[model samples]
Target: FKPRNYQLELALPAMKGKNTIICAPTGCGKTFVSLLICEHHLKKFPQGQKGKVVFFANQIPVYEQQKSVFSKYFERHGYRVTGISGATAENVPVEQIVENNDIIILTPQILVNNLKKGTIPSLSIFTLMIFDECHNTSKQHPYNMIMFNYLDQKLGGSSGPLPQVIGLTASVGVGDAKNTDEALDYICKLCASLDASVIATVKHNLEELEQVVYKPQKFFRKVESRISDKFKYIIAQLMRDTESLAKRICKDLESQIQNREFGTQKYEQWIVTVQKACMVKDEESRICKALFLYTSHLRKYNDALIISEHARMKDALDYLKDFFSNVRAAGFDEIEQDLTQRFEEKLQELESVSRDPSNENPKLEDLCFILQEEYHLNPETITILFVKTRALVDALKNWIEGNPKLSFLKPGILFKASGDHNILIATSVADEGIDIAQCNLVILYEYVGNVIKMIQGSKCFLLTSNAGVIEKEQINMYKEKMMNDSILRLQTWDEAVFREKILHIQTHEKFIRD
Candidate 1:
């Protein structure tokens, strides 16, 4: 198999039988490097003389994709590659599966489950372990869980030559670090997590490397929708009313919930806390039940507001309408009913105005225009439009499929439908390590604040679109951050010390084997 220069450069370290993390930009052949390493190791140990190679990815599509690539390279060379996921593990025993296949590719969850079940005949049978999108090997992810299990076994002295581990990732987020030291620590933790040292393209060859990575030129298209302000104001007012209800329920609650910032995890925790308080049902806390109920509905509506702004107006409106319909059917008590009634009234107002032609998502219109213009230039162009949620992807797909103008353009939802589609609407699922080389136009449908996510999306195509003014600025911010951390600079001594520890681990494996 042919290899790129950088591929050889990065694969050389892991091929030396050291645990390694190969950090290259997306489309730069990180997967190819993993393949080279696997092929080299297998050749050295001919005819299955070395143990089996186990490759793990978080999603089944990726797992299957890697298996396909591996098979293309190795199967003709007399290696067997098999893929197993939650869907396939039902009838086949784990032991039988691993024993039959020379290379196994599966989601981490299956391995974690089988490991816990002790059904795998022996973990020592594998000589190489490859983790695709291994940056997710952080707290509680099955990738981390499975690796921890491996570490425990090796540490406890059950071993042959420990599996040569290679972790592949496009980015390791600073894990929310506020400063350089914290960022360095996060980087080290990533290394420590996988027991691998990081390898990125050398600065001298980065320009040539980018040619392989092939990021698209970015186009910022701003949309100023005149009618969205009315919707935004209504949502704001509803939020204020919900806050008032919480304050009225408990005077002290304001300090706790009012001033608290809300992201995905933070808001989920807030709802959990309120629900727990409601369950206590003491004299003071019984009133908390209404607040809990109100907050739950409020959370949905708030999410709708955000989704409407970023995704689609019809989607947001449909969500709120569905929410209210369920609330009305559930038959809430007086207090809850009053809150429900208010919510219904607000939904009615939003829905009424949402029917206006001017109320359609400006971003969606801009996206259509951009797609049209791009297609006019190159009719064969393939595009991937990245949105924030699966629901949004579906919404966009539906809109595209229904619009007569867009009817000529085939649209596919990632992993669900496929067939020579000119356009693919995707969520973040497409960002990590999936081969989408056919895509030439990538639309940043919404702002992705995660630095890793931004970098991965940017690598999907050579000409991309940033839809709104805010997203344009956001894209720039992430670009600046990536530029600063492009080298993946971590403390030198930290990696050195960890490498020494890994050497000891390898030595221990040899000791036990002898």
Candidate 2:
């Protein structure tokens, strides 16, 4: 637990009473930086527990990990480190625990819950607060709520003592920010929220840190052939039919429902509106309800198609089938049942066609080949395969474990895996604070548009499926925007290449007849 020079370099400003945000890459010892600050703060306020530090993380596992890290470095160094979690003894007074511990690590929700119950200690009780995965502070994240209250108290001058705040993250991310200037402005605004300024290491220091950190060797895998088969054709036909049906619905609902992006705020709002209309129990409401159900089925079917590229075909088909089965079993009017029946029949027909071995996903096989090669080269090498769905995680685990050749991959859920398990299968859970330092090989089984989401050194397998083809037109626009934004970020960094490119950044469109 000895601090490295880079860790001290990042920690120095925070120790000097400046609210600091260490925006370093993963495995660059960001947590070590935080620990150094915690040690320094505890030493500064050794008289009483007034020098308390509350370390907040997004998830429970991450919070527990932080607690262990602090316990190792601080507890042995004559500082008391305790934790407050949902699993904590219910009878214990949390305020007393916080008052006694030198550094308390907790999930923000637990702290937020205690704050709401008026059971949390006063803001002045601590001299430092550390937020892990600090990029989540924006939006309605608990970190924002907790910090809002702290800022209110600190700015109002109502605090006996205000803690020095430190926000740590890999990348703040350009959440809704479109351009480069806005992205930097957003970071500054986020820093202001933490009462912190961005404290990134200079290039020399960054180079030194890089030398100490083991950056992974990068690999790229692209699907040479777009999967073309009867199964894919059937899925594509269903998607087209669903879109057409959505457009045929009430003209007023057309714009809201048709061409709607799934998993977005606006999509949820549309669902809410439909549910409200259905609650009235009118004939028109019933029709809308039936149409909405059909739309939901289409969306799930589309999800299956998209996931099929990254996951096993059988797994995706089973998911689609189960959903269809549930719809049939659910209580619904004959009209809704008829729509459900038709979809189930189509699903059955598609399943039959999908049974052909030729229908296998090329991307899935490609990943197996890549993984097989990596494992055979170094059996001890740990791999982390990032998929798009929890269902896919399990499916892939079963696939890896079931195959004798690939069984050594030992794919297990990242958070749920034991120490002996080498390969970890994760969804987006592996994207943040929880450590998988042994993960030298990262597999992007699917395309993640965010550059930050795809860490370097990891092998990226980019595959476009017939199912993915559905979103191609829609997503490509965002891709172009993202590219422009990247150029803007480069310009901010004074990259002369970007300055010239921005001037000649003419929009060019490419076309291919299907």
Candidate 3:
């Protein structure tokens, strides 16, 4: 496979054995560049000493997909690539699998477990390490934990066979940094985490890169909530009732939720925190089982509110129905019975409001309008709709199946999704994984997305409401600029300087741990 102008440029430092992060838009041959680097790494080694490559993906779906990619590309060259996750490793131990394979692709937790168990012996066996979606390397993510092991070993000054690091990602996030300087510091820590001295991308030929990547026409459709949302009112009032029951057990519970808008993610977080607080430890413990149960009920109502805002009113109804049914089955006490009875009383109101055509989600109608227009014009259009929750994906898939006009889109989930159908509804699984050349349309069910999700959402439609979501795109765009600028400044640092920075960070991390 011949490398494009941009691909060749991006792979140079990585090919030369420098730990590098290749940051470009998704589907722009990030994996292909990785393959080229892998080839070079393998070929450059002497006959007696062969290069062993480990490719790590954060999730299993990615693990399966990338393993085939490495296997297919390296097959003719006679390199064996094996992918093992928690499932595959069960049948065969990692040691046996490592001995049998030239390239190992897996989720990071598997490697972490093996390293701790002394099964694989050392983190230093491989000649090259590749982390897909390496932005996760910064946090306590399994990817970051792998680096902790690698760096901790390296910093101890034992001259072991530590592999060259290569990270592939579409975006490196700023992680809540409000300014470029903070953004730069956060990014530097990320770079230090991976021991990547250089962050490479298409510097001279962005137009060429853009043409190669599918740039979707993005449109932000604003949604106004149903004018008189009695459905929302019913659920909000029930949450208040749950809150009241909780406060009786713990007198201060009312102030915790006061003035916070119900059903938003912020409220969800607050309610979850309250639930966790119910289990705090003390000699004079405040751990009330009744309060904990009430908070749990509140959390469920918050979920129902969230789903109703983004999904069908009926979907939210289903969520509550299933939850309450499970609650009844569990044999709850008086508090539980009270909460359950309250939802049952409003069950008819929710169902009736859900059935009313006027109360239908405008965002869903907006989605249908876009889908209808696109399919009407070109029936061959391939569409990928991204949602946050798998439940919503299933709900939307069913919704599409039920509508005769939209049914032809043939919505399927991407885990095993796609068929004679055109539309594929999926969670964030599609964000970095799947690549279809004819995938001309992408729809975000809502604005709950990060920079990588936003960048990968090419030819996209973003549905938005007033619920503090419109600023996220702005934040992502701002961070994109900050990340690029940060990388440019970071690339100027001497290799030793970068290594030293990583060393200092590692020691600090250990200090914090201690």
Candidate 4:
């Protein structure tokens, strides 16, 4: 069948009416395998038998692009394709899904919400379901519900044929809360109870493997002074409001403690007043009210100040260590553990880089050397930096300025520079599908689980004569590591959990990076 190594692995399973999870790297032609499944399914129904199918993802732009890919193949084969996205209000319940030749591409959340609202008809006539970014199916995501409900109904209610399901991802791992067994078990529970099978796995050919290269990233640390007029003004305004809030909260807490001691109406009045003051006109609640507004504001500023000091590298580490030790001694074990361990580890990583004036990291150094040797550059070639955080982006800018031959610029500043400039520093705002069709050398700030994004960025390197494939395998391997982390078992904070609930963000980037 001229199958790619994993093609039969993925398709044969689905051919047997089973769902398959395809864990492979980017740019390896996973899309081709998925298209093969569609063709096989269509051929089986040669008598114009009709059913519904959906290719789903979380990102809207990717959804559109994948739909284009699907159409390129399907349109020639007499299939009608429909695209459904939550990007606009014009998207309501789409009718005529029953007319046949209907395949809908959508985001996971959009698809689940549509099903729940009865926008998409029952999949009794369904032939295929494809989910991209299936790694996001873990822990607190809509994909879980879609799988759960489909399986439940097939067993507990319907006697109809269940749809052939396919899960596609560059990274596949158990959810943080779900171990490998649980991930496989979840697939079995949903696929098997419905009498579905687990079918195929696909991967890139070796020729495809050799085409990718990666560049190592460099890091530069900076501690900008907090003495700017803008900073001072914001800090002054924050202090004014916070001081007032703190006074109010302190007064109320004191009154509550006093009330507990004396059982007096005066103290009780203070408690009521303080409680009343805490309400505010946020999206969650209407009407602004709070007795301790001043105190609350004070606390907010205090937290801001602590973060600011840390960012500036001006924080007193020994004092902070002692302060946390006291908190742990006072029985705040979780706080102590996180602050001393998780938070401390990240701080140390930053401190390590900060203390070393040199911006070289192990992988980044190797990548640069490869670049210099392959491209025949003597430290004068233009190098571009890609980072996810603004802080890292800014730090790289300052570091690049230390080089006389290197010209530092970003997307916002690229307009200001001549075409001859040799360096660009940018936050990942450029990584979200922008055309960086310039620059021969690309330096990643760090790998941040955006393997596909990295591949897209590599296109920038593909444009120049000096551009060379040097770092693709390393990034792809990192991507595979993320896929292996499919069991979504990472811990999260209460506030982050609240935000996740509020935002309906189920893929759960709910915790701070450590």
Candidate 5:
């Protein structure tokens, strides 16, 4: 219902009907600020001529989450709010539902596809457009796709009145920028993409904004590699057999690979290039046919290495099990049978070694210790365990099932019921725009992904490699400074000059007709 000083500071231009982006850190009420502008926007037009607002969120949870917040805030004032996910409107025509609603909360894909299909003829339907996480307005994202039409209409001048744009983001990232200069260009390109007049940051009320925002104190808990491990040894043996067979089948196979680190992601990526090379070569020859089949098996082995490096050895075994099972059920051949036999010989040992509680991964042990100590100090502590893969969510859940150390901390994937759960684990989707405020402690379980992860995983502990710790700090210290400086400098330009910069980008880029 009300905007804080910083929120108003960021929203002033947008409230004046100018397109603007608010750049602030996590959990500082970006959505709430947009809500204030929305309320002001609707009141400006009278009751009969009330405005329609379209809010875009990137994922399903936020689509519903934002709709709930907007509806709660607007419904009391006699405003109607509705959410249209891609599936919910399938039984009914999407346009009719959009027609009935005053406030629309939706995924960008819904609006983009509808616009393409003529369900909504143009972006001119709504009075205001709010883009959440607008930093995602890069080349291939749906946010950028929606803006493509905006620039198209904008460059030619309006057919009638146009919707004022409001964009919200925690960070405007440096797209592949190695230095500050490239990053500044990336931010301007993004502003141009959204046709934003200004990108605002909190300037007037710094201390108050910091007081309201929940920033978790970060800790570094570096983990060394698991050593003298029989499970890893067994996997290496199997991979070596596959490599030997591949070498015999194709005389130049070893030279082709050039001995990259065979069990790592970089090695898998290199092997993928080799597979593409194999794909275009002649297939009827015996060498080509044999090496082609061997590469398929090799790809699976590489995937097993990847899973093994991250999750519990048992989880990796499960991945290998599923792949071998499918391969066996689907085929009959000498090479295929040999590959299957190699796995069958060691599957039980792999299972036995992995199933033993004594053989649990050291990284998980470190994580359990961290959680145990924190919860012991303050039993009321709420925690988030952030991981990189959705599948690993289930795997780690199973790891925590009956373990005496871990089972006591109640856990789930999404929101908590009544301050009840201590630990919540989710994949990458929880990186930004997840609003679990009570979560004061976060464990980055073997993930050092990007700038967003460091900031979003508030009060985070890194349960990753020693090198990953250094990498995270380096990114945080440098990227955070560069991004802040970039935004501050962008904020200093005359509002119209900043608006004019978008014209140069729009004319030289996709929206230009001439």
Candidate 6:
């Protein structure tokens, strides 16, 4: 194939001994680069003189994208590549492919199974082994296990061929600076396990917001009231001066605790419990009343149906009045009554603190602290909270149904109709990238995502690295609403930059140029 400038640079050095991680956004010729590398290695010997270059993916089906890329290029270059998933077993005579085919792409499970089945061909002549989405270096994943198994074979354990290992991914653990070192360490260990040497680790830069364009639309809409006067009255109390309410509550609670007056510590513990109820919309257990209290809090804050943290403070009155009236009807009468009582007294206390004006209401202060400091919620950002079980989903749904109206909820919980929302509150299935539409809002009811799941789910707003500057890409294809082509244009630019990163860091001796 006639070379693109981007492809040539990477192809040249990859011809050498580099074990590279070509960090780029999707569609920037990543697979093309890999194809060139595979072809170069295959051509090292005579045609029809087979060699093994195994590709390990996190799971089956998801690797379709990568497989398509490999198949197209490999076949064009006079080589054959077959996919080995649970459905398509590559459990044939390895000698046939090893002599005729150029590369074999297998899921980690299949490759491990092949090893266990004793079906692999000799690999002393095996050229390369590629790991897609290498960001997930966790030991639990099959890729890690396969790495060790391959090592077992390569070290003269008598399994099959021992090929070179190449790992890949768009981002590593936690997607931050602190996690970078941890990911690097993990990658180094993976390399060690495979007896593969590190060639280059290129991280895509994210700075100018050039890689992605974010046009956030407010999900908040006006509410048709099921609100009550009593609810409004209580919320007005909380908002009497939103800043001082929480502070005053904390102070009084602290004072009571010091005096051992009123199960004060218990009340504080109740606050923690209530807070959990608030954040956990997907609990089917007995602590659900606490969750209702949280929904009520949002109800008060939700008038004009505020969908985000950036909503105006003054709007709290309208939002709360409408919010509470509806929440009570949502089947939380007992919980709502308790909250209303607490809110009334709390409002008076907050009002009293505001009488000092300059004095801060510490409880309100704490409220702000919790939203910002605790939950890490930012006004402009959104996330999708995932729950692994249908029961939790139902609990969350019950919570939402109790909301005066869900049409107004922002960053709310949802589920797939056919998946694990019915049984197994434990991790049987629906534990991985069970699709919840992305909105910069995610609340994992159970904290169950592995690295690859996180990547797939988070790809709703992918931070694909371009040539040293980070750009964002949305999986627009996954959504029903078609964003402006400008979003598509933004993706093209990021892809171009990604192409550059792949090309800039290529050499035969170093698969990644650096």
Better of 4 and 5 by TM-score: 5
TM-score of model 6 vs. true structure: 0.41
| Backbone clashes in model 2, listed as residue pairs | none
Q: Could you tell me the C-alpha RMSD of candidate 6 in Å?
A: 16.2
TM-score for each model = 0.48, 0.46, 0.53, 0.40, 0.52, 0.41
Over 360-422, each residue of candidate 5 has an lDDT whose tens digit, in order, gives: 677777777888888877777777777756666766776677567776787777434547667
lDDT (Cα, tens digit) per residue for candidate 2, span 1-514: 5666777778877888777777777888888888887877777754543577889877877877887888987788877888788887888888888877777888888788878888875677777888999878866589887876776565455556677889888775655666556655555556555666435443447556766665654444446434575655767677667656655665555334554444333444555555565456475765676667656766576567655656567777777777767766878766557656666667767777667787776777788888888777777666676766676777788778878878776667853236688887766543345433345577766634233232323343344433555356445545445544553454365324432332221111001100
Q: Between prediction 1 and prediction 4, which has the larger lDDT? A: 1
The TM-score of candidate 5 is 0.52
Ordered from best to worst lDDT, the candidate numbers read: 3, 5, 1, 2, 4, 6
Worst 10 residues of 1 by lDDT: 455-464
Model 4, 381-474: lDDT tens digits are 4555554445444433544454333332322222324555555666444234543324545555442323322321122222111112234544
Give one digit per residue, the lDDT tens place, for model 3 in 1-514: 6789999999999988889999988888887888889989999988787788998887878888888888888877898888888776376789888878889888889888888898988877788999899998965798987888887677767758799999999988888888888988888788778888788978898778877875665566667677778889999999887777666656666535555678866776687777677666452354467767777887777778877877788888888888888987986777678778878898887889999998888777888989998777887677778776666777788789888877667776762235476888766543445433246677777746443333332367777675465566666666777888887888788888877776677678765755
Off by over 4 Å in 1: 46-48, 158-160, 202-204, 216-488, 491-496, 500-514
Report the Cα lDDT for residue 255, model 6. Answer: 26
> Cα miss at 279, model 1 (Å)?
61
Q: CA shift at 426, candidate 3, in angstroms?
A: 29
Q: Per-residue lDDT of 155-219 in model 6, one digit per residue for the tens?
A: 43455645655665554333222333443444344334334333332222232222232333322
* Per-model CA lDDT versus the true structure: 0.69, 0.66, 0.78, 0.48, 0.77, 0.44
lDDT of 1 by residue, 1-514 (tens): 5676767888877878778887778778887888888888877775537568989877767877887888777788877888887877387787787889888887889877878788974457788889889899877799887777666566666554568889888876666665666666566667667877655444556666766665655555555554545676787687778878777867666324444432233464576677666666484656666677777876776566656665566777777777777877876678767777787788777877777787777667777777777787878666677776665676778789888877668888862235588788776643435433345566666535232222222323222233555566665656547534633454234667657755565455435444
Per-candidate count of clashing residue pairs (backbone under 3 Å) = 3, 0, 3, 41, 1, 50
Query: Model 3: number of clashes?
Result: 3
Clashing pairs in 3: 216-458, 216-459, 217-459
Better of 4 and 5 by lDDT: 5
The candidate scoring highest on lDDT is 3
